[PDB]
Amino acid sequence: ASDEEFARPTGQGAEIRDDGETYTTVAWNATKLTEGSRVTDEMRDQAMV
Amino acid sequence: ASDEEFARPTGQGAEIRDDGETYTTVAWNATKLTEGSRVTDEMRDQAMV
Ligand SMILES: [Mg+2]
Ligand SMILES: [Mg+2]
Ligand SMILES: [Mg+2]
């Protein structure tokens, strides 16, 4: 969203004027982070941990 | 079928190699064994047996 502004000093019976929210955007591009580990079956079985 | 073999001493994490059951045949080829005998009608009549 656009930064906040201030409402306007207005006469009685006078038109309420427009200062609408103007918009922009920021892009995301999510990078894949990966880590693996390999263990032998013998190691997986024998570990105390 | 092929003969039994001995399983292979292997490292950990190493590929288990293929030595699958292997097959052959022995082909039979049945050979016609034949035997003939001929006798005349006079021989057949005159013989005691
Ligand atoms: Mg007007
Ligand atoms: Mg403005
Ligand atoms: Mg073999």
TrEMBL record, chains A, B:
- On the tree of life, the source organism's domain of life is Viruses
What name is this protein filed under? HK97 gp5-like major capsid protein
For Mg(2+) 2, which residues are the binding ones? E5, D19
- Species for this entry: Haloferax tailed virus 1 (HFTV1)
**Binding sites annotated in the UniProt record for Mg(2+) 3:** F6, D19, E35
Q: Where does Mg(2+) 4 bind?
A: E15
